[PDB]
Structure 1
């Protein structure tokens, strides 16, 4: 009924760090994960439990910080921009499904402000 969670490991990809990928795991993800508003985003949205039959009809690319965390831990991303896109998709999903001023949107907006501030200090290429 729920979609399978996104893949988080690539079986043939070499392990390669970059300055930016190290920053995204050790600074960006770590900071957001511990925030008091992180919990609704730490795992895929369970649209069954929340009685939202239309969520996965409206959201074509589900994404969440638990998936991002595993991807970074497993070195799934080839570059930092793929990871940044996953964060942006997560926030977009919230803003296109939920009503403005819903509590979950306020929580997303607080997390996104912290995300964008950290991205402003992303190491150079």
Structure 2
């Protein structure tokens, strides 16, 4: 069994649409999403189909770019830090679960390098 996915909709949660969050969608998410190594990270890990029965025993804070994309498109966030944390959670999960050197780790590292370069130029708030 897979767990329920992370929340992407919560009408109780206060929301903003801001230039930093717009950057996170238009520059950061879109840059990583189109990458040749994006595909393992475009949706929640399906531990059943991938035969990783211990994945959610080890990973208790799942995150993926499919979830982040939905959160950004549906204006789920209050600030950029929340979204940046989601990306970092996704990368960290990969490094925590997988054997050092594995293809998936190299893929995460390539995406993380781009992520860091884009976040380095996060625009100042308007």
Identify whether the pair has TM-score above 0.5, normalized to the shorter chain.
Answer: yes
Distance 2:15 2:28 in 1: 20
Compared CA separation, residues 113 and 11, structure 1 to 2 (3 A): same
TM score, norm. by length of structure 2: 0.94
| SS, match of residue 4 in structure 2 | coil
After TM superposition, the runs of 4+ consecutive aligned structure 1 residues lying more than 3 A away are: 12-15
Q: Is the Cα–Cα contact under 8 Å of residues 16 and 77 in structure 2 kept in the other structure?
A: no
Q: Name the CA shift for 1:14/1:96 in 2 (closer, same or farther; >3 Å).
A: closer
TM-score by length of 1: 0.95
Extract unaligned runs of 5+ from structure 1: none
Q: Deviations over 1:16-69 (max 9, x none)?
A: 311110100011001110000000000000011111111100001000000000
- 2:91, 2:112 within 8 Å by CA — same for their partners in 1? yes
Instruction: Out of 111-120 and 10-19, give the one that drifted further.
Output: 10-19
CA contact (8 A) 2:15 2:77 kept: no
